[PDB]
Design a protein around this ligand. Structure first.
Ligand code: NA
Ligand code: NA
Ligand code: NA
Ligand code: NA
Ligand code: NA
Ligand code: NA
Lengths: 90, 90, 90, 90
């Protein structure tokens, strides 16, 4: 489960990194950052400047938001919860 | 269900596209983009400049956020989940 | 329930409108807009410029986000859902 | 539960405050603000300017978003709900 959401999240971010670095001309790290803050809805960066960028982003949001939060709802619910929960036991 | 959330999401975005292109003077694609990042809460674009735009946006957020995420909670929960889940079966 | 979440959401937004118009010097409509996009996490506007504004916003987010989404999870789950659901019945 | 989510949220924000004030050169209050709007997804501030800042932020989002909302889903669900609910009783 977690490992699978891990991989799926990775592929989604890799695709975003390749897309924005190519079409929006971003450095890879900036392309990855944009992909991450977009899918997590933080959206603290300027929007895409090209129409291709805008269209892809719209589809990217709809298809990737569900996956990213599903993964997050496990990274802390099935991995970080116990580590802290079990330790909260004297 | 999915098909219905599909259509409802479409109508909501169409209304947003017409509204922002007319009142905020955005090109249709930019009006659609603003509508999408607003309802998904990414909000990476500058806010509306007119009071009419601000008022509509406030109402648009409250009435459309629930629908958009409901749709998303199906596009990946009842459509993208199986496609990957079932295939995860040797 | 809905009517109560309605009122609670209203009071929260009224407080935000008064606060930002006074401390950040925003016109009331802009103060209301900032309050709304902040609590719904759209956050498409520039952040507060004063330290008082930043501190209040931090507390405002933590105390109001839960309420605002609870209300939203009813405005469409217990009000907009039936209207469309029941009508989907031939 | 609440008290524990309280503390965990605190530590996460303290780490963010120290990180951004040091690496991005922000005043402590601004570092705390950035940490808060990032983890709650409001993201109304300019993104980090350094690559170290971008990388940390990516990891910070994935590890802290779940915790922050879990806490929020208690600050109003197990603390602010009764206070208003019980009082709604004549
Ligand atoms: Na956001
Ligand atoms: Na945002
Ligand atoms: Na912004
Ligand atoms: Na958000
Ligand atoms: Na933003
Ligand atoms: Na800007």
């Amino acid at each position: 489960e977690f490992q699978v959401l891990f991989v799926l999240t990775i592929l989604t971010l890799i695709s975003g990194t390749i897309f924005y670095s190519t079409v929006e001309g971003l450095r890879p790290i900036d392309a990855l950052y944009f992909s991450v803050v977009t899918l997590t809805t933080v959206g603290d960066t300027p929007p895409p400047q090209t129409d291709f960028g805008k269209i892809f982003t719209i589809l990217y949001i709809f298809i990737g938001i569900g996956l990213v939060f599903g993964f997050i709802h496990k990274l802390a619910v099935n991995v970080q919860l116990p580590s802290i929960l079990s330790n909260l036991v004297p």
